[PDB]
C-alpha cells in the first residue's frame, strides 16, 4: 500500500520456518506495511516438531525494549498485532502497552490473535501454559478491536463449546460483547454443507453508525481442507487479515475473502512440495510442512479469489 | 532465483528499523532465498539512536538453537551470512558451526560481514567490544569465502591503515591471504577521481582454474555520497551481495554493480523521505534515516544499473 501504516507486531520467532513473527512480517511487508517486530520468544523451530529449544522473554525483557523505543520517541503505531507468548506477565504487559498507545492514537487498531491451543483430532488441549487463558479472557480480549480465534481458543474464551453453526454465531456475538467489533473463527468442525473435506470459518463484524444504528455483518466460508496439520497458518492469517480489513474496513466479506484465498494458495503450494519431499503414500513431516512463504510472495500480494464468502 | 537455496543468517535484530537480520532477511527473501534467521541480539533499535535497550545472546543460547536444529536434522545450508555480535564467545562458536557445516556440505559459501566499527568523521572507533577483533581476525576471516569489510574494519583486520587506492588493493590481497577469495571494501576516503561527494568501493576476487592458473578480478566503483550517516546499509549490501554473486559467481563487476545500484536507489529513496520528515535546513535524525526497505521492494528485486564499475 501507499499510505504510511506502522504495525507493532509482538509474537514468537523461530530460526527455521514460518510461524510467529516469521510468518507475519513478510506478508505485511510485501503488502506495504511498516513493521516493528518484538519477538516474544526465539526457538529453533515451532513446537510442532519433536524437539524445540530456544529462549523466552519476560515482562522485564519486554519493558526494556518498549522503554528503548519509548526513550527515542518512536513508540507510535497505527496497528498492534499480538500472538504467541508463554508468559502471562508478558501478555499482561502488552495490554498496558496497547492501551498507553491507544491513548496517544485513538485511531489505533489492535488485532489480537488469541494463540493458546489447537483443535485437532476432535476437541483439544492448549499448547501454552494455562495461566494465559485468564489473562487473554479478562485483560486482552476486552481491549481488542479484531480477534482471530481458533474454534478451540474461541470456545476457550467465551467458556463454551460449539456444536452448531448457531452456537458458533453466538460465541461471536458474545466475543464482540467482550470487546472486539470484528470477530473471526478461522475454522471449525461444523458439519459443512458440502464435504467433511471442507473447513468452515465464520466472521462477524459490528459497526455503530453516526446515527446510532448498528450495522451488522455476518459471513460464513467453506474452505477446501488439506490432508495435513500446518503451523503458522493462523499467524499468516491475522497478519494478512490486518492488511485487507485496513483496505476494506466495512467489507468483512471481501477482506476475509482475499485473505482466505491467499491462504488457500500458499497452503496448496505447501502441501504440494511437502508431498514431494515425503513421497507417495508417506506423510509429510512438520519440517516438510513449513509454509512456502517466499514462493507465495505474488499470491500474498494479489491473491485470486478462490473462496466465495456466503453472507448470513 | 528459481533453485532451492537456504541461507543461515546470524545477526542482530531490532524491533524498529532496518539493520541486522531485519535489513538482510527481506532482501534475500524477495530475492528467492530461503532464510534461516538467528538473532544474535534483540534491541529496541540500532545503537545509532541516543538510547537503545535490548537483550543479547551468549554461546549457550546460540548452542540451544543450533542443537534444536541439529536434533531435527535441519541444520543443512547452502550459505551462511553473519554479522553483528557483541559476544566473542558467540562469534567463536559461530565459526565452529560454520566448519561443521562446511564438512557436511563442501559446496557451502560463507559470507562474512566483519561488523565491528565505523569509519566516520575521519578515522573511526569500533561499536562493539574489542575482544572481537582478535576473533574475527584469527578465527573468522580464515574460514570466510566472502568478506564485506568497512574501510575501517578492513584496516582493523589487516592491521594497517589505508591512505591510497594501492594501500587499499594491498589489504584486499592481504585479506584474501587470510582466507576469503572474494573481498569487498564497501567504501573509503580515497580521493575519488571525481568529487569529494563520491564514495569509493573496491572489490577483489581470486579464482583457481582447474589448470592451476589463478584468474584475478579487480574492480573499483564511485558511488554518489549521500549527505548522511545511515545504519544497516552494510548489512543490506552483504545480503544482496550474497544474492548476486550467487547469480554471477565469476562476475564480481556485475554482482557488485547490481548490489550497489540497489543500494543507491534504496538510499536515494530514504534520504528523500528523511529530509521530508526533518524539513529544509534541518538534519534527518537517525530515526528519520531508517532505510525504506519495503518501499524499495521492486528496486531490490531488479535494480537499474546506475553505477558502472571500473575494471582495474
Ligand atoms: N488444513 C487446512 N486446510 C485448509 N485450510 C487451512 C488448513 N489449515 C489452516 N487453514 C487456513 O489457515 C487459517 C488458519 O486456520 P487455523 O487452523 O484455525 O489456524 P491456527 O490453528 O493456526 O490459528 C484458516 O483461515 C484456514 O483457512
Ligand atoms: N552516505 C552514503 N552515500 C552513498 N552510499 C552509501 C552511503 N552510506 C552507505 N552507502 C551504501 O551502502 C553500502 C554500505 O556501505 P558502508 O556504509 O561503508 O557499510 P556499513 O553500513 O557496514 O558502514 C555502501 O557500500 C554504499 O554502497
Ligand atoms: C512458537 C509458535 N508460534 C506460533 C504458533 C502458531 O501456530 P498456528 O498459527 O498454526 O496456530 C505455534 C504453534 C508456535 O509453536
Ligand atoms: C544493532 C546493530 N546492528 C547492525 C549494525 C550494523 O550497521 P552497518 O550495516 O551500518 O554496519 C549496527 C550499527 C547496530 O547497532
Ligand atoms: Zn493460532
Ligand atoms: Zn557493517
Question: A78 to chain B: which residues are within 8 Å by CB?
Answer: none
Helices (H), chain B: 21-31, 59-72, 88-104, 132-135, 141-143, 151-158, 165-178, 233-247, 252-278, 297-301
- The answer to whether the CB of A268 falls within 8 A of the CB of A261 is no
Closest CB from A34, A42, A65 relative to B294: A34
Length of chain A: 312
**Which residue of A lies nearest to B48 if distances are taken between CA atoms?**
A72
Query: Does any ligand 1 atom lie closer than 6 A to the CB of residue A225?
Result: yes
> What spacing in Å lies between the alpha carbon of B233 and ligand 2's midpoint?
5
CA distance A184 to A151: 9
- The answer to whether the CB of A52 falls within 8 A of the CB of B68 is yes
> What spacing in Å lies between the alpha carbon of A294 and ligand 3's midpoint?
18
CA distance A259 to A203: 12
**Is there a contact between A30 and B32 if contact means CB atoms under 8 Å apart?**
no
Grid look-up 490486518 returns: A242
> What spacing in Å lies between the alpha carbon of A196 and ligand 1's midpoint?
15
Q: Which three cell numbers stand for residue A202?
A: 465464520
CA distance B81 to A117: 35
Grid look-up 500500500 returns: A1
CA distance A215 to A218: 10
Given the residues A78, A145, A235, A299, select the one marked as catalytic.
A235
List Cβ neighbours of B276 (8 Å cut-off, separation of 6 or more). none
Q: Which three cell numbers stand for residue B148?
A: 564485506
CA distance B238 to A173: 51
List Cβ neighbours of A188 (8 Å cut-off, separation of 6 or more). A119, A151, A162, A168, A199, A200, A201, A202
- The answer to whether the CB of A116 falls within 8 A of the CB of A128 is yes
CA distance A16 to A289: 12
**Is there a contact between B54 and A65 if contact means CB atoms under 8 Å apart?**
yes
Q: Does domain A1-312 have CATH number 3.40.50.300?
A: no
Closest CB from A13, A32, A44 relative to B39: A13
Q: Is A235 a catalytic residue?
A: yes
Q: Which numbered atom of ligand 2 lies nearest the CA of B113?
A: 22
A67 assigned ligand-binding residue: no
Question: Solving technique for this entry?
Answer: X-ray
Query: Does any ligand 1 atom lie closer than 6 A to the CB of residue A200?
Result: no
DSSP state of A33: -
Closest CB from A32, A38, A294 relative to B15: A38
- The answer to whether the CB of B205 falls within 8 A of the CB of B181 is yes
Burial class of residue B210 in the structure, from the number of CB atoms within 10 Å of its CB (0-12 exposed, 13-18 middle, 19+ buried): exposed
Question: Backbone dihedral region of A36: left (phi > 0), alpha (psi from -120 to 50 degrees) or beta?
Answer: beta
CA distance A141 to B71: 37
Sign, CA torsion B63/B65/B66/B72: positive
Q: Which three cell numbers stand for residue A126?
A: 492448549
Residues with Cβ within 6 A of ligand 4?
B 12, 14, 19-20, 43, 46-47, 84, 115, 127, 231-235
DSSP-assigned states of every residue in B96-127: HHHHHHHHH-TT-EEEE----EE--SSS-EES
Query: Does any ligand 1 atom lie closer than 6 A to the CB of residue A223?
Result: yes
> What spacing in Å lies between the alpha carbon of A54 and ligand 3's midpoint?
14
Q: Which three cell numbers stand for residue B200?
A: 569509493
Question: What are the backbone angles phi and psi of residue B50, rounded to the nearest 5°?
Answer: -50, -45
- The answer to whether the CB of A241 falls within 8 A of the CB of A146 is yes
Residues of A near B (CB-CB distance < 8 A)? Answer: 13, 15-16, 22, 26, 29-30, 32-34, 36-39, 42-45, 49-55, 57, 61, 64-69, 71-74, 287, 293-294, 297
Amino acid at each position: 500500500m501507499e499510505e504510511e501504516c506502522r504495525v507493532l507486531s509482538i509474537q514468537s520467532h523461530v530460526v527455521r520456518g514460518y510461524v510467529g513473527n516469521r510468518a507475519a512480517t513478510f506478508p505485511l511487508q510485501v503488502l506495504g506495511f511498516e513493521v516493528d517486530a518484538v519477538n516474544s520468544v526465539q526457538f529453533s523451530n515451532h513446537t510442532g516438531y519433536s524437539h524445540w529449544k530456544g529462549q523466552v522473554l519476560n515482562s522485564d525483557e519486554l519493558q526494556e525494549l518498549y522503554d528503548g523505543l519509548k526513550l527515542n520517541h518512536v513508540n507510535q503505531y497505527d496497528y498492534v498485532l499480538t500472538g504467541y507468548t508463554r508468559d502471562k506477565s508478558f501478555l499482561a504487559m502488552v495490554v498496558d502497552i496497547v492501551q498507553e498507545l491507544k491513548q496517544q492514537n485513538p485511531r489505533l487498531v489492535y488485532v489480537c490473535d488469541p494463540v493458546m491451543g489447537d483443535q485437532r483430532n476432535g476437541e483439544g488441549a492448549m499448547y501454552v501454559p494455562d495461566d494465559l487463558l485468564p489473562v487473554y479472557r479478562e485483560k486482552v480480549v476486552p481491549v481488542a478491536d479484531i480477534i482471530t480465534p481458533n474454534q478451540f481458543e474461541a470456545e476457550l474464551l467465551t467458556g463454551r463449546k460449539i456444536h452448531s453453526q448457531e452456537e458458533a454465531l453466538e460465541v461471536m456475538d458474545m466475543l464482540h460483547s467482550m470487546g472486539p467489533d470484528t470477530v473471526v473463527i478461522t475454522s471449525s468442525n461444523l458439519l459443512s454443507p458440502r464435504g467433511s473435506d471442507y473447513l468452515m470459518a465464520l466472521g462477524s463484524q459490528r459497526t455503530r453508525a453516526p446515527d446510532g444504528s448498528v450495522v451488522t455483518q455476518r459471513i460464513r466460508m467453506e474452505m477446501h481442507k488439506v490432508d495435513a496439520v500446518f503451523v503458522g497458518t493462523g499467524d499468516l492469517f491475522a497478519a494478512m487479515l490486518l492488511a485487507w480489513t485496513h483496505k476494506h474496513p466495512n467489507n468483512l466479506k471481501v477482506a476475509c475473502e482475499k485473505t482466505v484465498s491467499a491462504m488457500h494458495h500458499v497452503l496448496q503450494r505447501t502441501i504440494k512440495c511437502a508431498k514431494a519431499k515425503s513421497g507417495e503414500g508417506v506423510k509429510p513431516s512438520p519440517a516438510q510442512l513449513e509454509l512456502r512463504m517466499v514462493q507465495s510472495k505474488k499470491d500474498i500480494e494479489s491473491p485470486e479469489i478462490v473462496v466465495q464468502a456466503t453472507v448470513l
